[PDB]
Amino acid sequence: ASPFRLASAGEISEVQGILRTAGLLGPEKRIAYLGVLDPARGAGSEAEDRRFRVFIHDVSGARPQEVTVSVTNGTVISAVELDTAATGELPVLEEEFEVVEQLLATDERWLKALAARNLDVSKVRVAPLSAGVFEYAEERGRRILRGLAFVQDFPEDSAWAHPVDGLVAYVDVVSKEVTRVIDTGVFPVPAEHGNYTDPELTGPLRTTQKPISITQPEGPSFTVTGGNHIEWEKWSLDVGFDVREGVVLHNIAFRDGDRLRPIINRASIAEMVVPYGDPSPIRSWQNYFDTGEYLVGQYANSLELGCDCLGDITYLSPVISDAFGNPREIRNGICMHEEDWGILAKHSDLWSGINYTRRNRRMVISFFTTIGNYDYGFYWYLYLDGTIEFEAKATGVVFTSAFPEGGSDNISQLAPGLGAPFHQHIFSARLDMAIDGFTNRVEEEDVVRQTMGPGNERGNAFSRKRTVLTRESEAVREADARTGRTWIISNPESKNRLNEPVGYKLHAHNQPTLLADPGSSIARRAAFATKDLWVTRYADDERYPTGDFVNQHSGGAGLPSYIAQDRDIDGQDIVVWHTFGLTHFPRVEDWPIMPVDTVGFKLRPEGFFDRSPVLDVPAN
Amino acid sequence: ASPFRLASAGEISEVQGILRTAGLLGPEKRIAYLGVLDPARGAGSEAEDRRFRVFIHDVSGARPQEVTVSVTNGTVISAVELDTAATGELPVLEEEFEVVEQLLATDERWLKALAARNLDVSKVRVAPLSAGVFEYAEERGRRILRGLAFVQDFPEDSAWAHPVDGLVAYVDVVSKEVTRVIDTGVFPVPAEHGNYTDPELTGPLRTTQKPISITQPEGPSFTVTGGNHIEWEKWSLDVGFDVREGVVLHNIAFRDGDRLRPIINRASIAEMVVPYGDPSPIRSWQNYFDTGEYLVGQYANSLELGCDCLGDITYLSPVISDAFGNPREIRNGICMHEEDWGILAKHSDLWSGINYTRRNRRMVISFFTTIGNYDYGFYWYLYLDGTIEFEAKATGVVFTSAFPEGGSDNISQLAPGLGAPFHQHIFSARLDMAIDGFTNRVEEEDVVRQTMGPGNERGNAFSRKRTVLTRESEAVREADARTGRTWIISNPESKNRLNEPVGYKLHAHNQPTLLADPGSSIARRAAFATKDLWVTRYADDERYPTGDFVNQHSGGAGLPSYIAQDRDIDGQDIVVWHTFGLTHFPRVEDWPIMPVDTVGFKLRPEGFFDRSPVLDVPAN
């Protein structure tokens, strides 16, 4: 049908079948990751060769393996044994989070820690956080997780309101042993509850809200064919889904007259880091790689009609694989609908007497993911005028700590005795560019100010400078809001009627990048977050900014290594990597449940079309 | 009733009556401006003393006058004669724009200019642009306008498509004489039409768009009392309207429990400049002060249902005064409605098993204004969580020129032989702060990075610094996106339950400010645009960043002078002035009609409330 179609339950089963028949899926193997591979560069090869990539964990202690399978031919294409102590461990497993509370419950030094605090073990919940690479040399090669405790007064209580400070415990999940229990001191456990559902806290619910009914009596303007192909207002694309990256967009093209023009080949949020700014030994190791370590698409929520998505909604229910190879369906995990977006263009002309007004619309493709305390919304927008935008919505419950008596320079106080450490939410978007084809280049555009004098008189002139990025070694860029720095991706071999290269301009929000000291562990492991834009030559194996195995890997694996190749990017098949995020100094208004905050970027046509592409929109 | 209510037709008439009876409104007087004054600082004075301010122009040649009237008592409170050659001229009059095409039509040197270009005078439209203060010493004291020609092939033709380059003419509108006609050279007149209504250009209109129906079967959630008082989701305010500033917001307060908390006293866009970056003598003088010189609210459009504002709309029809003192009604000039705004807060908790989701809503108050080629949308948003946001939407038709053969560093080409000079759209918001009262202060917050070492180990810590602005002379600030610079406005005498000052944080977009050389005419006249934030001590006569008489004034009159007073702003009655804008390098996609582009800012609660203020929102 289409080589970009969503993986079916049948295919997941066939992989389990092929892995089983080839002796790779024994009773002790666990699938840490499984996802389809994208078709190869060279769409000339006719015939579907639907391949999958599988990361197989081993519970007895044996070396894990990276396996590639071809469901079409029913064979295993390759299988490599992995040296995790070198290339990094595999993604964490759902079944492993549950082991850290169980193991520590019967640990003598943990129980002694809780006794000194008069805390009942049946009420202590332990949060299984990923472990970076720090001092501890005995963790190398071993699959570790770290726990932090939160007291839950009753089954429906928000344990986040009761952090147990001064206590951390490392645990080896494979051999199932607690490697350490560190107790720096006793901190009072914040007693105030944080139950945003308790009528005591909420007070009487407002009755002033009248309904806002959004419908489409004739149905949506977009069509879905082949399960995931979308056709909307001249736009064309395929909505894919990977258990690691979540929603992924393929073949984004625009129908310019009698021509389907490609813009972006593949787009996804390829990584996401949440570094913590608390210098305390109890949290200085805290860094979530939501995409790399936990796999974003795995924890996707099922969206509800009227609550999560309002209007005329069309859902997609992606198919994931559980740890044993059985197909698992995320029902209504993808929302799709069109939205009104105010005025698109308007002018009341005095001379002609013509009054013109046109409404704008955007299409929305979204999914939500929950990862421990936080929930994130991923939104992609396509507008009538050719603009493409991405938006991340951060919500959920802020990670808490104890607010030290003397106050703190790295923690916010949210209630009496309750703290919340400073952190960032950093995203990395992978944009496989196909601006009117694969011959693309990136130019950095700066505004330039002119001194009053020769050309200038009056001193009113100002210009713009554009330098082309030619080699990968000079494609690592920093933002500059003062000079209005932006980046244009063009195709030198495709020109508009004015005989100028077609292009698209990238507008960043210019928020701060990674604040962690340059020599820190997190700086090395998340080097991508230290710069706003990276451009690399395309390669099939260069998929993530942090590499393929992020969990407990030591650093350098992603972009810093790809970039060292110093490949030519002037008029080639390039990939743009945009770093963007939020610096969060939690405020009282964020407790007990955090209201949505947002970050993103957008891409607008820069001489792509011959004139305005929305001249043919009617007036409803 | 309420001293903030909209000026009625009756009051406008009474002013005409009082001005007439006092011999100030003779047959030769023209009202260049008329608007109510805001109540005095000291709301203790009971009894309405509804005053008005009137700028009276004189057509015979006599000195204009600034008059203050009290419609309540039926008397003229004060009347001063103005020396325009010193303090600046009055705003331009509608009846004066029409004189510049008529005068030049019978001017020998103009006709000779058009003859050399084989252009028929009955087809040449002249655009009456405001005149700054430049070389010409003979313009001082005289009321001047400058014209630029555009050919209109037929009555419904878009003349913007046919700029007549190399030609400018200055005209004295009061004595009605053409002072100069400058012809630098003949430029080919772009022949391609730009009629976005012509089916040739539009092609067949799309039929793929299905309706999006937005209704409210039970009516809106907001109430309007006293003609302009709004009560919506704990929000309280008065929607005013001034012919110069447009929509103005008064007494913005939030109902926190059994308490109506003030946040902002008065908010408006007090100035707006559109500088042009073309160094050519034909346009190097071009600078629109949309608010200062043309009066934004005067050119407000009447909004249509379904086209301009969609949903359950409630209109306000402000009353302006024509040039003779007669009440003129702008029907449906103000749109008001509430909008759904996605997810407000959401979390699916593993430990408690509780799945929480709440939708967000924003209220919208908007109006649109047309000024020559451009149309601007002014939008104010109030969200459930206490966030306040402003958004300017730029559209219309780009001002065109001839694209020089050798190309240009300050002009964009939009079609064959058709150019469009570089420019900016700069806005200035005046925020009269009343954060929980009038004892406010402004702190500039910067993110601070920490070196790996002592407190830090691991090098993961990062903080925030906050310096208070105490004297007006140190309250002139520049943005810094790299360190995440923001500004918090707090009330040192009001504290939250954690015993910390209540506040609100200002988030700017960090776009570039004025690019014009420091010593230029426009830099002096629009000094406010050279810095992102200004804070001044409140005073009744300090109303605009550019002063009271912007037209042909030489510079320094606004903020640079107010600021020199060096008044204490630490815990006083302060006013925040935020500069924000768009740098526009027109692209082909902007021709023939420009799609909406936006700028703005927002203010979010920073420890204002004791906890999240949206805990009581229900789940519809």
The domain of B333 spans: 196-619
The percent of chain B in helix, strand and coil, each rounded to the nearest 5, is 10, 40, 45
Give the distance from residue B283's alpha carbon to the nearest chain A alpha carbon, in angstroms. Answer: 10
**CB nearest to B211's CB, from A217, A451, A522:** A217
Whose structure tokens read 């993103």? A600
Q: To 10 degrees, the CA torsion angle through A405, A407, A411, A413? A: 70
Question: What is the spatial distance between Cα A59 and Cα B62, in angstroms, rounded to a whole number?
Answer: 96
Whose structure tokens read 């655009």? B127
- Is residue A376 a known part of a binding site? yes
Question: What is the spatial distance between Cα A574 and Cα A572, in angstroms, rounded to a whole number?
Answer: 6
Phi-psi region of A592 (alpha: psi -120 to 50; beta: other; left: phi over 0): alpha
B35 and B104 inside one domain: no
Question: What is the spatial distance between Cα B613 and Cα A491, in angstroms, rounded to a whole number?
Answer: 50
Which chain B residues in 273-302 lie under 8 Å from chain A, judged by CB atoms? 275-279, 281, 284-285, 287, 301
Would the CA dihedral through A362, A365, A370, A376 be positive or negative? negative
The tokens describing A282, both together, are 């109890």
**CB nearest to B393's CB, from A343, A413, A606:** A343
B17-56 b/e (C-beta count within 10 Å ≥ 16 → b): ebbeeeebbeeebbbbbbbbbbbeeeeeeeeeebbbbbbb
Give the distance from residue A413's alpha carbon to the nearest chain B alpha carbon, in angstroms. Answer: 8
Experimental method: X-ray
Question: What is the spatial distance between Cα B131 and Cα B120, in angstroms, rounded to a whole number?
Answer: 26
- Collect all residues with Cβ–Cβ distance below 8 Å to A394 and sequence separation of at least 6: A374, A376, A377, A425, A582, A584, A594, A596, A597, A598, A599
Asked if the bond preceding A592 is cis, omega within 30° of 0, the reply is: yes
- 3-state SS string over B271-294? EEEEEECCCCCCCCCCEEECCCCC
DSSP state of A287: E
3-state class of B602 per DSSP?
strand
The tokens describing A374, both together, are 């936080």
Which chain B residues in 356-375 lie under 8 Å from chain A, judged by CB atoms? 356-357, 359-361, 368, 370, 372-373, 375
**CB nearest to A205's CB, from B281, B591, B616:** B616
Residue A493 Cα distances to A359, A436, A496, B211, angstroms = 34, 9, 10, 40
The percent of chain A in helix, strand and coil, each rounded to the nearest 5, is 10, 40, 45
What type of residue is B317?
A: S
3-state class of A578 per DSSP?
strand
B499 touches chain A (CB under 8 A): no
For B29, the enclosing helix (H) or strand (E) is strand B29-36
For A273, the enclosing helix (H) or strand (E) is strand A260-275
Question: What is the spatial distance between Cα B494 and Cα B113, in angstroms, rounded to a whole number?
Answer: 68
For B116, the enclosing helix (H) or strand (E) is none
First-to-final CA distance of chain A: 36
3-state class of B159 per DSSP?
helix
The tokens describing A237, both together, are 């694309």
Question: Which neighbouring-strand residues pair with A449?
Answer: A462
3-state class of B121 per DSSP?
helix
Question: What is the spatial distance between Cα B347 and Cα B358, in angstroms, rounded to a whole number?
Answer: 10
Name which of B213, B417, B348, B482 is nearest A513 in CA terms: B482
Whose structure tokens read 């997941």? A12
Question: What is the spatial distance between Cα A588 and Cα B386, in angstroms, rounded to a whole number?
Answer: 13
Question: What is the spatial distance between Cα B299 and Cα A190, in angstroms, rounded to a whole number?
Answer: 58
A344 touches chain B (CB under 8 A): yes
Residue B286 Cα distances to A111, B277, B282, angstroms = 77, 9, 9
- Count: domains in chain A: 3
CATH number of the domain to which B484 belongs: 2.70.98.20
What are the DSSP E strand ranges found in B406-485? 411-415, 418-421, 423-433, 441-449, 462-469, 476-477
Question: What is the spatial distance between Cα B485 and Cα B478, in angstroms, rounded to a whole number?
Answer: 9
3-state class of B261 per DSSP?
strand
Which chain B residues in 183-222 lie under 8 Å from chain A, judged by CB atoms? 196-197, 201-221
Q: Are A178 and A103 in contact (CB under 8 A)?
A: yes
For A329, the enclosing helix (H) or strand (E) is strand A327-329
Q: Are B232 and B224 in contact (CB under 8 A)?
A: no
A214 and A248 inside one domain: yes
Name which of B94, B90, B33, B41 is nearest B64 in CA terms: B90
- The side-by-side arrangement of strands in the sheet containing A411-415 is A401-402, A418-421, A411-415
Q: Are A150 and A124 in contact (CB under 8 A)?
A: yes
Would the CA dihedral through A534, A540, A541, A543 be positive or negative? positive
Question: What is the spatial distance between Cα B364 and Cα B378, in angstroms, rounded to a whole number?
Answer: 10
First-to-final CA distance of chain B: 36
Which chain B residues in 572-611 lie under 8 Å from chain A, judged by CB atoms? 583, 585, 587-596, 604-611
Q: How many helices (H) and strands (E) does chain B have?
A: 8, 34
Residue A184 Cα distances to A135, A179, A181, B133, B176, angstroms = 17, 16, 10, 70, 86
3-state class of B187 per DSSP?
coil
Q: For an interface test with B, give the residue of A589, A601, A610 to mutate (most B CBs within 10 A).
A: A589
Whose structure tokens read 């010409």? B136
Give the distance from residue A304's alpha carbon to the nearest chain B alpha carbon, in angstroms. Answer: 10
Name which of A420, A471, A457, A427 is nearest A589 in CA terms: A420
- Collect all residues with Cβ–Cβ distance below 8 Å to B188 and sequence separation of at least 6: B402, B417
Q: For an interface test with A, give the residue of B462, B505, B585, B603 to mutate (most A CBs within 10 A).
A: B462
CATH number of the domain to which B64 belongs: 3.10.450.40
- Collect all residues with Cβ–Cβ distance below 8 Å to A542 and sequence separation of at least 6: A536, A562, A575
Q: Could you tell me how far CA A14 lies from the centroid of its own chain?
A: 29
3-state class of A104 per DSSP?
helix
**CB nearest to B456's CB, from A279, A481, A523:** A279
3-state class of B133 per DSSP?
coil
Computed on alpha carbons and rounded to an integer, the radius of gyration of chain A in Å comes to 26
In total, chain B counts a number of residues equal to 620
DSSP state of A225: E
Name which of B396, B376, B414, B410 is nearest B193 in CA terms: B414
Which chain B residues in 385-404 lie under 8 Å from chain A, judged by CB atoms? 385-386, 393, 395-397
The tokens describing A256, both together, are 């310019």
Question: What is the spatial distance between Cα A431 and Cα A579, in angstroms, rounded to a whole number?
Answer: 11
The tokens describing A457, both together, are 């008189």
Name which of A130, A399, A166, A96 is nearest A287 in CA terms: A130
Phi-psi region of B325 (alpha: psi -120 to 50; beta: other; left: phi over 0): left
Residue B509 Cα distances to A208, A507, B422, B577, angstroms = 33, 12, 20, 15
Question: What is the spatial distance between Cα B33 and Cα B296, in angstroms, rounded to a whole number?
Answer: 11
B145 and B251 inside one domain: no
Among B67, B87, B107, the domain-final residue is B87
B343 touches chain A (CB under 8 A): yes
Q: Are A552 and A89 in contact (CB under 8 A)?
A: yes
Residue B246 Cα distances to A246, A434, B299, B309, B378, angstroms = 46, 45, 9, 18, 9
Contact state of B308 with A343 under an 8 Å Cβ cutoff: yes
Question: What is the spatial distance between Cα A266 and Cα A268, in angstroms, rounded to a whole number?
Answer: 7
Question: What is the spatial distance between Cα B276 and Cα A274, in angstroms, rounded to a whole number?
Answer: 43
Question: What is the spatial distance between Cα A394 and Cα B197, in angstroms, rounded to a whole number?
Answer: 43
Whose structure tokens read 């990597």? A577
Q: Are B378 and B392 in contact (CB under 8 A)?
A: yes
Question: What is the spatial distance between Cα B129 and Cα A583, in angstroms, rounded to a whole number?
Answer: 45
A519-530 b/e (C-beta count within 10 Å ≥ 16 → b): ebbbbbbbbbbb
Question: What is the spatial distance between Cα A483 and Cα A441, in angstroms, rounded to a whole number?
Answer: 21
- Is residue A372 a known part of a binding site? yes
A500 and A547 inside one domain: yes
Residue B270 Cα distances to A587, B40, B247, B273, B553, angstroms = 31, 19, 10, 11, 17
Residue B157 Cα distances to A248, A619, B126, B200, B349, angstroms = 46, 20, 14, 14, 62
Residues of chain B positioned with their CB less than 8 A from the CB of A451: 517
Q: Are A220 and A312 in contact (CB under 8 A)?
A: yes
Could you count the other beta carbons within 10 Å of the beta carbon of residue B391? 17
Q: Are A313 and A367 in contact (CB under 8 A)?
A: no
3-state class of B103 per DSSP?
helix
- Phi and psi at A94, nearest 5°, equal -55, -45
Question: What is the spatial distance between Cα A225 and Cα B162, in angstroms, rounded to a whole number?
Answer: 46
A61 touches chain B (CB under 8 A): no
Question: What is the spatial distance between Cα B184 and Cα B168, in angstroms, rounded to a whole number?
Answer: 9
3-state class of B483 per DSSP?
helix
Name which of B366, B364, B370, B425 is nearest B396 in CA terms: B370
Whose structure tokens read 């999940």? A173
Among A195, A215, A242, the domain-final residue is A195
- 3-state SS string over B35-76? EECCCCCCCCCCCCCCEEEEEEEECCCCCCEEEEEECCCCEE
Give the distance from residue A299's alpha carbon to the nearest chain B alpha carbon, in angstroms. Answer: 11
- Collect all residues with Cβ–Cβ distance below 8 Å to A94 and sequence separation of at least 6: A298, A323
Active-site annotation of A, residues: 290, 374
What type of residue is A243?
A: V
- Is residue B549 a known part of a binding site? no
- The side-by-side arrangement of strands in the sheet containing A29-36 is A29-36, A51-58, A65-70, A75-81
Q: Could you tell me how far CA A532 lies from the centroid of its own chain?
A: 16
For B77, the enclosing helix (H) or strand (E) is strand B75-81
Q: How many helices (H) and strands (E) does chain A have?
A: 8, 34
Contact state of A617 with B351 under an 8 Å Cβ cutoff: no
For A607, the enclosing helix (H) or strand (E) is none
B119 and B81 inside one domain: no
Residues of chain A positioned with their CB less than 8 A from the CB of B507: none
What type of residue is B175?
A: S
B83 and B101 inside one domain: no
Would the CA dihedral through A434, B583, A348, B311 be positive or negative? positive
A182 touches chain B (CB under 8 A): no
A364 and A294 inside one domain: yes
- The side-by-side arrangement of strands in the sheet containing B124-130 is B124-130, B144-151, B163-172, B177-183
A56-89 b/e (C-beta count within 10 Å ≥ 16 → b): bbbbeeeebbbbebbbeeeebeeeeebebeeebb
Q: What DSSP assignment string belongs to A229-263?
A: EEEETTEEEEEEEETTTEEEEEEEEEE-SS-EEEE
Question: Which neighbouring-strand residues pair with B70?
Answer: B51, B75
Question: What is the spatial distance between Cα A619 and Cα A609, in angstroms, rounded to a whole number?
Answer: 22
Among A68, A87, A106, the domain-final residue is A87
Question: What is the spatial distance between Cα A41 and Cα A3, in angstroms, rounded to a whole number?
Answer: 13
A386 and A497 inside one domain: yes
Q: What is the resolution of this structure in A?
A: 2.2
Q: To 10 degrees, the CA torsion angle through A548, A553, A556, A557? A: -20
Computed on alpha carbons and rounded to an integer, the radius of gyration of chain B in Å comes to 26
DSSP state of A300: B
Question: What is the spatial distance between Cα A134 and Cα B513, in angstroms, rounded to a whole number?
Answer: 44
Residue B523 Cα distances to A109, A463, A550, B134, B429, angstroms = 70, 17, 52, 12, 18
Contact state of B593 with A517 under an 8 Å Cβ cutoff: no
Contact state of A461 with B278 under an 8 Å Cβ cutoff: yes
Q: To 10 degrees, the CA torsion angle through B80, B81, B87, B93? A: 100
Strand B594-605 relative to strand B388-396, pairing: antiparallel
Asked if the bond preceding B592 is cis, omega within 30° of 0, the reply is: yes
B151 and B251 inside one domain: no
Residues of chain B positioned with their CB less than 8 A from the CB of A447: 512, 515, 583
A459 touches chain B (CB under 8 A): yes
3-state class of A167 per DSSP?
strand
Nearest CA in chain A to B486: A511
Q: Are B248 and B380 in contact (CB under 8 A)?
A: no
B485 and B534 inside one domain: yes
B466 and B361 inside one domain: yes
B376 and B456 inside one domain: yes
